[PDB]
Design a protein around this ligand. Structure first.
Ligand SMILES: [Mn+2]
Ligand SMILES: [Mn+2]
Ligand SMILES: [Mn+2]
Ligand SMILES: [Mn+2]
Ligand SMILES: [Mn+2]
Ligand SMILES: [Mn+2]
Ligand SMILES: [Mn+2]
Ligand SMILES: [Mn+2]
Lengths: 369, 369, 369, 369
């Protein structure tokens, strides 16, 4: 059906815990909820970012303006079902702004899938799994608190995979923090870390081996995003798997990292990659090059999380599971239904499209003036 | 719907012209027509090969046995709509035999698309084009005859892109043959060549430059398929684009050729790559690496040709068009409808699924005893 | 003498123990027994594969059809003694299908050698050894059972070299399994492993060092066959020798692996390499590049095993011996005589040709209808 | 049969034309005729070298002493038919001295083949050809004389492939010399050159392109034998094929040149490579790496030439033919029969073994005191 209109709504949703960034602690996450109307039906999407233009160069503000002034005008009047043309049109009209493009792409997939009475995962080709082991990020900043948090998640059978943020304290302090957590969880959980580009090469070369010795199973983005050479050397010299996050963006960057096996795994993220088809292309490059696919997140609401789940549910292998905990870090929901986490895994919501619908009262409430 | 059964039928269809191979001239092409039955509906597919185990290691005989004894048994009872699982199940149960897997994959896509009332191209994401410039292969073995053939195709507006098979005669003879054709067609047509692995590196290094000087626009598989190093060196040293054909098979081989830009283009072929999803993964690697996608053929009947057209219709760019002339090299059709070539391009057949249906009377007639 | 005819017979021989494959446990091995008749005399060969199209893309079914429809017709009428021409004719007429070609090549060598009253090993140039240390594969799936099996083989002086299949259980479980076996056999036996492409690069990079520390002397195909880069990196970073199995096929692949010492050893296998001359060419590349030759097997019957023994008996060095235990895994014999294993080594059967003859009553009995 | 004795005889045979070397013009070639006696039968071999320790480090004198004092003593008492053990025993007892080893290896092959009533080519596996296009070396030092010589060889249908020695005169003079020859022979002959290590890299980089432009089809050893880097760069930058001669010796050197395609072709020479099996291993490496095999010569007598012919007759491809003209450069024959050159090719002598026998009266006459 012809696209009638594309609306963008910036919603500010409070987070249950503060978000420490550079030199400003955020108390909420901002999203751009996208709604595509065609043939009376509606498809929804989400344009995300972490704490503003910090994780990436996009923000809820840039996303809305990019869609409103450039992307939306170009798509109105076009066949909503032609996902191929929609993707190419956006790429040829706007450079970068992958998150804004992803919000629209997700909405178009939701709309098309519903029209066919299929889940997005089914539209893509079918599910390989209906649930995915999910990792919980421990970053309270306190060792004792993190240990209690982890033991709690394990006992309630919600999470037995944890990601610890490192880089803020000293390397020595980070190692002790990790050793304490590993000792506490024993053989009941796996521990991964994310240095968030916090170490230079020599620091990472010294401490990654110690992290591995301490029991760490995965080290995410230890060095600055542009330092592909350091990543490759660290990956070649260490047994523990290295995960690329910020180093990934375009399909080209995926190929570049893959070329000489600069990392062992790619953190797939719908928003930073530009959408579903684009994320699947990156996953194809990883599969072709012998690199693992990881289900990454941008602390998305239920809309973005559902979108990511449908994509990851179709991949052949997810050796490290996913980290789609956004809906639980937020203090409220923007959708009518909630996602389910049971027996250490997050479950794919049933139904056509994303399997989740916008709670207009919630969206209305959190819409920023 | 649950897969009820998968039938395989070897059909031998006479070719309008002989097929010179090694030391045996074939007078027909053999296909394995696959039919998947689920929920009363049927999806059709084709397992192809060129002149038997010559172009590749598979033949209509190996394909039928592989499907009957290994692949079919594993899929019966499974959800026909789960293309993801079907693809993975086949890959984990059988090594290689990509053509046999492709026949089943095409049938499953046809079945699923029809059930949704979509063309396969629409199911994949939507068309970027509804017609594709098509190249005609000139290989009568006679210069005068080829020139008449080309002028005829140009005047009737059927083809203005021609592929000349080289390697049989001497390099000097091949060059004169090419020069005569180029002089004859003038600025009304483009000339490409396929050496079919016929030259060693030094021979190719000497004559490719001469072919380029003569006006050739694309040189396909000049050296043996396993010689990736020679391909890379020839590609680095020559301006004329080099196309990989036999060197491509698995997704891994695509990545290997892409890694150091061993060629400028990949000849996509559904059967030698294992299916639609697999071919799309190869196309994604090419896109990621800056390598062109070419619509290749295995002299397929209308079934296989339609399948390939639906896939290529969705790709962002086809700088050299395609060569899906199989239906016109065959002396008869296996489908009820015929494909249309008009104004130098082959057109995507309208309708759901492949957009073509098996003419059971034709299939019955050419079925081998 | 002129080749009068080439017959193919598919025989299904029960195995003493089940053969766990993907998701189907096989209870027998299928072979294609080839018989070449020329000048009244007969030469025999075997076309093998492991559990069907699993280890490789060929099966007893594809092998028979390839020989019957393509290879056999081309050789009938040709001089059976011209092994050079026979090998080239097959390679130029059929792509791949090395196992089918190997069956015929073995038969031609047997026929020619007998006609000269020489063993095949003598025809090749002469023996360097008349017996070869043989490794027994422990894969009962139970640690206690494997330990009893090994101690038994050691005490009876049949085997003091064991190969343990890994990859099914978790890496941690595999390591404990290995540690238990090593502790049990002490200094009375050597332990090797075959991961059967079961690990990705990071997993192999972590556990191979642990296997080496545990006492493992050889690690076979730890990663997927197409991942030459991972093999090379693992080989460069680990002291324990890495053996290529599935990564080897064509002479070209041997050169590719050898180029940058991607592995320390090549598993020579007559069937997957295309025959005796082809296997000797691969061994020559290994010798030239400083890579070890290993006597590999495809769980062959006495016919294929005898063929392999004659070839390996002529090589200058076999630092890890061989694994030609096929005849003992089978529940019956297809030949009149049995091979002898004594004092930890398998002995070359005396006599001309292969030194073994087909028991027609046995072949007749196991011939599949 | 047990080897009874191995005799060595240095024979000095006058050449029809002088042999200009460094600063001493030789008027004859010296060979070491080897005779192996076992079970009453005799096998003959030849240890060659060009103009003494010039082309290589061996001479008829070193060869005789090496065989008499080291190799012969070790083989007496051993089974003459075990070619595998004979080859390994020699390699483990003596370093280098490949020509001396080759003389014995040829004799053992001759002896074994005769005992089986087979030609050496048949023993190796069978012939691919019974005649080989042969190149004649033009090196009279005079352009007019060379032109007459070539026209004569063409008209008598003896040779239409010529090799011109370069490097003595200036590059400019060599080019004019080549241009004159090419103009004279027209399309009736091909011209190759051998610079005999006479140019440094820059000189070769400038003139090889000019030689190619002038019509040269093959450039042999343009730079010093140890300069593999220069060879590779010249090979990468020029279309005309580059042939390695002096750069080849051990199997290791063959692999080294092959690794990065340092040359397009290898000049196979039985004496400088250590024998038949060793030469076949080098040919296998070339085949594996995509490098051409050329039938090289050391200006051998009929014995060495026959040996080389039997080997080259079995190879799959000889794109540049051979240069086995030794018997015609010599002023007399050491064998009872003469080799035949007809219709531009040299023919494989019929009969078992080498197909040629020593004329004891001739050998006796030319034996040096
Ligand atoms: Mn690593
Ligand atoms: Mn991260
Ligand atoms: Mn180029
Ligand atoms: Mn082609
Ligand atoms: Mn190593
Ligand atoms: Mn193995
Ligand atoms: Mn070159
Ligand atoms: Mn030379």
């Amino acid at each position: 059906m012809k696209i009638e209109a594309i609306s963008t709504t910036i919603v500010d949703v409070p987070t249950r815990r503060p978000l420490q960034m550079s030199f400003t602690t955020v108390h909420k996450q901002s999203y751009v909820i996208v709604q595509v109307k065609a043939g009376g039906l509606v498809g929804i999407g989400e344009g995300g970012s972490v704490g503003g233009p910090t994780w990436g160069s996009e923000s809820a503000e840039t996303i809305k303006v990019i869609i409103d002034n450039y992307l939306a005008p170009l798509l109105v009047g076009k066949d909503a079902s032609n996902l191929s043309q929609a993707r190419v049109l956006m790429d040829r009209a706007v450079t970068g702004n992958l998150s804004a493009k992803a919000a629209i792409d997700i909405a178009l997939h939701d709309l098309k899938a519903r029209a066919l009475n299929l889940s997005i995962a089914d539209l893509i080709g079918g599910t390989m799994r209906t649930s995915i082991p999910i990792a919980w990020t421990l970053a309270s900043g306190d060792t004792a608190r993190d240990i209690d948090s982890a033991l709690e998640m394990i006992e309630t059978r919600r999470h037995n995979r944890f990601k610890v943020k490192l880089g803020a304290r000293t390397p020595a302090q980070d190692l002790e923090h990790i050793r304490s957590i590993v000792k506490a969880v024993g053989d009941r959980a796996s521990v991964r870390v994310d240095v968030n580009q916090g170490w230079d090469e020599q620091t990472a070369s010294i401490w990654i081996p110690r992290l591995e010795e301490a029991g760490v199973e995965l080290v995410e983005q230890p060095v600055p995003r542009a330092n592909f050479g350091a990543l490759r050397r660290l990956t070649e010299q260490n047994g523990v798997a290295i995960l690329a996050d910020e180093s990934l963006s375009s399909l080209s960057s995926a190929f570049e990292l893959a070329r000489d096996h600069a990392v062992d795994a790619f953190s797939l993220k719908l928003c930073n990659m530009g959408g579903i088809a684009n994320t699947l292309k990156v996953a194809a490059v990883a599969e072709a090059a012998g690199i693992s696919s990881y289900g990454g997140t941008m602390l998305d609401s239920t809309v973005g999380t559902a979108a990511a789940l449908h994509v990851y549910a179709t991949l052949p292998s997810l050796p490290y599971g996913c980290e789609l905990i956004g809906p639980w870090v937020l203090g409220d929901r923007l959708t009518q239904q909630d996602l389910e986490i049971k027996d250490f895994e997050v479950h794919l919501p049933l139904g056509s499209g994303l399997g989740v619908d916008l709670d207009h009262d919630k969206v209305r409430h959190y819409t920023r003036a």
